[PDB]
Amino acid sequence: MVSAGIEAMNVFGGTAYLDVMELAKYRHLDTARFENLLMKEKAVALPYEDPVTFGVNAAKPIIDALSEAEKDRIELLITCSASGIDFGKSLSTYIHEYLGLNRNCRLFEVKQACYSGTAGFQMAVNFILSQTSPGAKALVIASDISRDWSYAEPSAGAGAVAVLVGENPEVFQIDPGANGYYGYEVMDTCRPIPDSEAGDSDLSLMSYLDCCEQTFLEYQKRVPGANYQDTFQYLAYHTPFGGMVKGAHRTMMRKVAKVKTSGIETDFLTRVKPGLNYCQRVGNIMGAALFLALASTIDQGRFDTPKRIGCFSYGSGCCSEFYSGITTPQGQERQRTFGIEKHLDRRYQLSMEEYELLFKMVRFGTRNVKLDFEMIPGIMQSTQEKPRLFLEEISEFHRKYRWIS
Amino acid sequence: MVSAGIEAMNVFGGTAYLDVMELAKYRHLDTARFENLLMKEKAVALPYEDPVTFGVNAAKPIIDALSEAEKDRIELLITCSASGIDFGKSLSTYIHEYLGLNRNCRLFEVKQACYSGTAGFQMAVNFILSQTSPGAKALVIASDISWSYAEPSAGAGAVAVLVGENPEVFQIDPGANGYYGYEVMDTCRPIPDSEAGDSDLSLMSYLDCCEQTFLEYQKRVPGANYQDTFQYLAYHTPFGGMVKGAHRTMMRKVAKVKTSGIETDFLTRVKPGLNYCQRVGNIMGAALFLALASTIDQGRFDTPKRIGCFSYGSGCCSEFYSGITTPQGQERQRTFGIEKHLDRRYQLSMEEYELLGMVRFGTRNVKLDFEMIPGIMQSTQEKPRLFLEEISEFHRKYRWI
């Protein structure tokens, strides 16, 4: 009865960020409202980045750490996004090429707003559990770029998280069948126009919270004895902003309760706040948000002994899922190697003049364009860690990328 | 330890169709070039139809035939398309709602050009083989809607596939799977409501894939032989003529044959599966499933037979896989009356067709006119069908008629 889940995972939260407290000042936000979001930085995608670049840059460090043998066992590549490049051609075609994966691989894209990431990972888990290809691995990459409204801008991020799924899952071993999924059609938020978003913030909030409770109810119906306090040493949630998550943890704890106010903040600090650390520095990364909170929990939390982590996923539209897995001290050590924090520390800080120039070329249907890596001369020269991918040009709709450092 | 595959499957090849013999006639085409297409009819999507409507109408006869307890076991809904209506919101949200599925369900959309359908099927199969939800089923719905030699094959359609632990219709050979992909710009949909592509490059990749996928399958299934392991073959069928040429190209490489061997083999193993595609047109992610449906209905299953399936999607990714169909599976398929459904579709005149209408991607407010072609609202089907009545602030609203 084979084990399944995460062998390795890595975050790319942009090559550039904005200080979102400075942004609030510039935009004149109500102090209390802005501070209640609980956000500090957002990644900002540049004209020569796209979801392929963002995805390759997240997965590259995983792939570089693997042997040849291991790399050739990746046989499922799934890109989860709401930032598609084509109605038909998936991001996974380009990601596969520039990662140098084996041609013996299924490649496709999965879509369901912010739930995409989980949909991907669940399907990759069932591939491993199915033993249709003994020894094989899957790579799931959630990659999204952003494109009531005044208060959204400080959380509107860009990011990607790449997750390698396999038969030796030290980072996050799933509890198999321990899943409460739940969905129904609601028009809370959508992307009906290319390069554009729409939605009803009060509705999204209600549906998120309704799904947070139903998903757990469903999990419990499948996992007798499941106790929202006792079973899980940490909790990770889909994090569109920190304040949303703090609100929902409070709601859940009162619903499965007999606790005090101070018991609720206590539980927040122990089990939840570790997961919000990276989320606060990247923004809402949509499909990849829960993965980012999960990575955050694993890097920032305490793993002296194995811990069970409870995960809640939500996407607009809507679908959701609660599931759980165990993280070992060894998995925590492996994640340390990627240096996610260190990477986030090295991004280039935009000024408000730089950022206002972008917040107002590479539109979704672009047929030909050549890009200039000097459109902000600092950035490229600024940081030069390892090779990163950038969009160099589109000709006849074909996108061509290049390695730089 | 558990069996897996198709328990039931159904096709919705449109409300209306165009006789493509007449179109070629009326458009003065070179008749050798047109004829080698091997197309007879195509489905034509009306303005009040979209991929939701196509998907629900494909799936609704399956759901009707299920018991309520069976229906409540559908815990995965995958919609497969390149005709998406939103960058984030899957087609599955709306199809879930109008089929009345249980809310204890995962739902999402999958994309990889004409391979989307196979990708979604294979993930559904792995759901079953994982036994992460013993007794669960999935529903996989491929639904798409589309050098004036392209016009006669530009169809619209959907095929719904119920996947489960009791698969009489198509039981998969577990792990008998040869997948193969790489980046190539053969065809794409880079603008909403548009296709671009390179005809030659597409033909080449499709043939490259047909060869590579089979080799991988044989790597995994020792003793597998293109001629004897498979009693029928189904292929991604944008149009009949390319499947005939593909089949011929493969046998040419791999087959010991006498002079009419390739013809005989085409008539025997491939032609059945072409029957429905020639009446519907290229339906992209659903083409292969339509060729499989056609094979099961039109083929001979007095004993269990193995069907090999070849899937291609531009861009590209591809897979060759196989499974068994039983006599009982054919009978269950026959209860859906697919050919009869195709036979009852509304035939458009040439001028009715010429009204070229459409709801563009990204429409925010529109109200549809069901009287745009009045004959169609006249003319009964056996079942209530789903149509698009209105978009309000991007929210699509549907109606049964």
UniProtKB/Swiss-Prot annotation, chain A:
Pathway: Antibiotic biosynthesis; bacillaene biosynthesis. Coiled coil: none annotated. The keyword Ion transport does not apply. It catalyses: 3-oxobutanoyl-[ACP] + acetyl-[ACP] + H2O = (3S)-hydroxy-3-methylglutaryl-[ACP] + holo-[ACP] + H(+). It is found in: Cytoplasm. Keywords: Antibiotic biosynthesis, Cytoplasm, Transferase. The active site is at 82 (proton donor/acceptor), 114 (acyl-thioester intermediate), 238 (proton donor/acceptor). Signal peptide: none annotated. GO terms for molecular function: hydroxymethylglutaryl-CoA synthase activity. One of its GO terms (cellular component) is cytoplasm. InterPro entries: HMG_CoA_synt_C_dom, HMG_CoA_synth_N, Thiolase-like. SUPFAM superfamilies: Thiolase-like. This is Polyketide biosynthesis 3-hydroxy-3-methylglutaryl-ACP synthase PksG. The gene is pksG.
Curated annotation (Swiss-Prot), chain B:
Pathway: Antibiotic biosynthesis; bacillaene biosynthesis. Keywords: Antibiotic biosynthesis, Cytoplasm, Transferase. GO terms for cellular component: cytoplasm. One of its GO terms (molecular function) is hydroxymethylglutaryl-CoA synthase activity. The keyword Transcription regulation does not apply. Gene3D superfamilies: 3.40.47.10. CDD domains: init_cond_enzymes. Involved in some intermediate steps for the synthesis of the antibiotic polyketide bacillaene which is involved in secondary metabolism. It catalyzes the aldol condensation between the acetyl group attached to the acyl-carrier-protein AcpK (Ac-AcpK) and a beta-ketothioester polyketide intermediate linked to one of the consecutive thiolation domains of PksL. This is Polyketide biosynthesis 3-hydroxy-3-methylglutaryl-ACP synthase PksG. It comes from Bacillus subtilis (strain 168). The lineage of its organism: Bacteria, Bacillati, Bacillota, Bacilli, Bacillales. The gene is pksG.
